[PDB]
Design a protein around this nucleic acid. Structure first.
Ligand SMILES: [Mg+2]
Lengths: 119, 155, 164, 73
RNA sequence: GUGGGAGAGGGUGGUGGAAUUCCCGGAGUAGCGGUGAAAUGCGCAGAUACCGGGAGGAACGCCGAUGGCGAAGGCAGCCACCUGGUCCACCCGUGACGCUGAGGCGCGAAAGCGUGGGGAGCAAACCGGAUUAGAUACCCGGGUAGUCCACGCCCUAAACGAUGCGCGCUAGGUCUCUGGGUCUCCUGGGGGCCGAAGCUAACGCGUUAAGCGCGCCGCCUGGGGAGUACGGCCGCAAGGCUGAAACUCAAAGGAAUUGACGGGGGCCCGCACAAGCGGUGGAGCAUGUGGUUUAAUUCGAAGCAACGCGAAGAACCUUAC
RNA sequence: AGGCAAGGAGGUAAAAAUGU
RNA sequence: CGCGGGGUGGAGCAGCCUGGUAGCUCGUCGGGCUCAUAACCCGAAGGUCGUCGGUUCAAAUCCGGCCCCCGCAACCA
């Protein structure tokens, strides 16, 4: 319904699901695909093959909206972000440059009890 | 078992074709220790094949073998507390063995009277692209690329 | 509890049950599918191996959700269990009683199991005496269902609430 | 373990306490807005500390990137 | 004293982005979140993820260290201020002015509690859901006190180098910082690591000693009773300090040493698993066993390693009953 | 491209109670 | 009896609600883990859905009778 040709890919990479959101040169997204879109409702939700599949799905979706040029933003390290990256590279997609941006706080609030003991 | 890579076995080649594959197949066919009965059966099957699909009865066999082969096969490992199916590659030798086994299995779960007949039909099927062994191979293949979820454990 | 959905019936004469209770009669698969499409629903095969195969025009996902909920609620509404002994004393007994009471209040069935070993001679007797006393104590919020059941070396008492 | 591009030695003579010069300290912030350590910088403890202070000042100003983004991977 | 020098030392006044969450605007859709697995949980009044803006509140990633400061608790964005101690060089001044410290005053993490503010995250109590035989727990989702600031208390501690402070002396080496130097190497002052002597119950320590001394204080006098009871004192209260007995037992304790074990780490092995064929387990029977029964079912064998075993020959005999 | 590494990762993450 | 909700493996229920599919938890039975027990693991035995019918091709289920039971109603006299 929309279209833009140039743009970004965002990979939020958590434990439980490797989420891929694909977006325009401004910042408003076109489509997003997850492990739970193509099955995978569980622990295997957060799994490298699953992530790869999700990425592929996202790419396909992008291709339907007439999308060519893609810049890569990895946000974090969930289990298969590398796999996802590889998939993206593969898809016959105009894969530009690879960029890693962490939402690591510059020591902010003391987190939950599963990031605790790691101080 | 943790020492040696332990040897893949040597077979004395065939007494009609001069091919170790054939001998292996015969051995596989052989339950209860009667090669000198099962080899006759194999010969009969070959003859039947020759009669029906006007092909070389060695060539047909080879074709069947080629058809029944899996490239990504599935295995069993307990990781995380729970057992997950692990899909990975097959060594050529091992793959061949597997194929042979599956052909054998197909032969024993076919319909007709004399075993020779069943074996012949199975061979024909394999040559074509369908059958029981072929079906099993396909199933195996499907089991991989669907459970490739846990294919981050190459072992 | 699993059946084949949408175009997935491998038949060329599927009998169409509508969304109300009707028997619409003996129809095609394609026609059934079209009917399903018309109501914004899907086609479920509820009795697959007969003469004319069964096409029920229902909502599948919702049905399955309902089924899953049913399966859940039934098991978890629960049986909660306490394991005593032959030789039981006072404070411990009181504690156990309290626990049982708490469980009852929660809204769950109570089960009193005893673990036996050492001369099956006056094992049923003491077991009965203690268990019956327990029952007597909690004949305010709990009642008796399966009376003292020593079945070899497996004694079990089942206790159900007064106001669930 | 860092052993080919000793970041102290390659860049010549200068002052540590000059924060308006950004290309001089561009050596010292790594790929991200992260400082290089003693195994990478090749500075005296005291000297290193001074450098860090300077970098912090620069960050507060703006000149040197506060948090950058890791290109290539 | 002059002359420097390092420092997250301490307080006061700011302010810097990353992050979080909140709230809008966008665009977007069916799940997200979670986990050993899941469920609660939130999401079609459109969540999550994604960009734009702010609203807040905390804490400050890297540098960062095994480092530095402080008496100790402790202390880290960064600046500014006020301000501690310290260390050196000069040996310039004073001329034994020192060292300790019963009491006392003073500080004194974190929690608590009072009063008011703030309130994002976290998060006792508390409610959930799972785990479970039971779960008041670990796992997961909320969530209030509280964390934060201010005043005022409290004042305990693995307040620990489990090592009081002061000085002197007694082999080195090595790294670490920090100063002075005639600056490939000295010299001082810290912080570690390895060790001469020596000590010590050893482990260890070993110019930062637990060595060898002296000085002065603190406390020890078996464990448990018990940091309790009584009193006294302090505290708004929690409690704290101070500190017994009666009784009661022949051990309480430490170091190591063998071994034993470990749901400790490495390396190996075995038909141990895997890979493979085919059985037992199911059918019937053949046995032997348990069990019962019975006049007697002779006796023993007990997880592997008892169970087609002693029995490699029970009609009598055997043969014990 | 390797020789040995120096680091950031997420897989190990089954739960296991006693004595006739 | 007046009205409504249901009777399901030995006991409690999921299915009834969309007509085909009756499962699970506990109890009995046996083995195995084990040094033994607990749990555990795996099964065996155990219902035709109170039940008679009808509807329906297939009834647990839609529906009616009856048993009933429960809950209520036994009120103004
Ligand atoms: Mg048992």
């Amino acid at each position: 319904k929309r279209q833009v040709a140039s743009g970004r890919a965002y990979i939020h990479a958590s434990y439980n699901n490797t989420i891929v959101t694909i977006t325009d040169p401004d910042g408003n997204p076109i489509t997003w695909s997850s492990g739970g879109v193509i099955g995978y409702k569980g622990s295997r939700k957060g799994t490298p093959y699953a992530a790869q599949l999700a990425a592929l799905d996202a790419a396909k979706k992008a291709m339907a909206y007439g999308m060519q040029s893609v810049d890569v933003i990895v946000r974090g390290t969930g289990a298969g972000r590398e796999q996802a990256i590889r998939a993206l590279q593969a898809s016959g997609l105009q894969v530009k440059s690879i960029v890693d941006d962490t939402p690591v706080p510059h020591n902010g609030c003391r987190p939950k009890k599963k990031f605790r003991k790691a101080s | 078992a943790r020492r040696r890579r332990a040897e893949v076995r040597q077979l004395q080649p065939d007494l009609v074709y001069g091919d170790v594959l054939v001998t292996a197949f015969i051995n596989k066919i052989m339950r209860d220790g009667k090669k000198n009965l099962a080899a006759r059966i194999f010969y009969d099957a070959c003859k039947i094949i020759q009669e029906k699909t006007g092909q070389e009865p060695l060539k047909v066999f080879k074709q069947a073998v080629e058809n029944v082969k899996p490239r990504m096969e599935v295995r069993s490992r307990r990781v995380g507390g729970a057992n997950y199916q692990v899909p990975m590659e097959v060594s050529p030798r091992r793959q061949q063995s597997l194929a042979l086994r599956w052909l054998v299995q197909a032969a024993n779960q076919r319909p007709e009277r004399r075993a020779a007949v069943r074996i012949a039909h199975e061979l024909m099927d394999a040559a074509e692209g369908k059958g029981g062994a072929v079906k099993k191979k396909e199933d195996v293949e499907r089991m991989a690329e669907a459970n490739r979820a846990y294919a981050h454990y190459r072992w | 509890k699993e059946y084949l959905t949408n175009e997935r019936i491998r038949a060329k004469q599927v009998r169409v049950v509508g969304p109300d209770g009707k028997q619409l009669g003996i129809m095609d698969t394609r026609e059934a599918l079209r009917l399903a499409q018309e109501m914004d629903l899907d086609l479920v095969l509820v009795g697959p191996n007969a003469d004319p195969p069964v096409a029920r025009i229902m909502d599948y996902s919702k049905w399955r959700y309902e089924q899953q909920m049913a399966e859940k609620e039934a098991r978890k509404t629960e049986v909660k269990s306490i394991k005593f002994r032959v030789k039981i004393d006072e404070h411990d007994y009181q504690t156990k009683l309290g626990h049982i009471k708490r469980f009852l209040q929660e809204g769950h069935k109570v089960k009193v199991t005893i673990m036996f070993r050492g001369r099956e001679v006056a094992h049923p007797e003491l077991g009965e005496r203690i268990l019956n006393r327990v029952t007597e104590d909690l004949k305010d919020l709990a009642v008796v269902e399966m009376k003292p059941e020593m079945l070899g070396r497996d004694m079990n008492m089942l206790l159900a609430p007064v106001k669930v | 373990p860092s052993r080919k591009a000793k970041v102290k030695a390659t860049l010549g003579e200068f002052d540590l306490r000059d924060y308006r010069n950004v290309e001089v300290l561009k050596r010292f912030l790594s790929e991200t807005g992260k400082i290089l350590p003693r195994r990478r910088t090749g500075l005296s403890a005291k000297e290193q500390r001074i450098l860090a202070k300077t970098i912090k000042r620069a960050r507060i100003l703006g000149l040197l990137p506060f948090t950058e983004k890791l290109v290539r991977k």
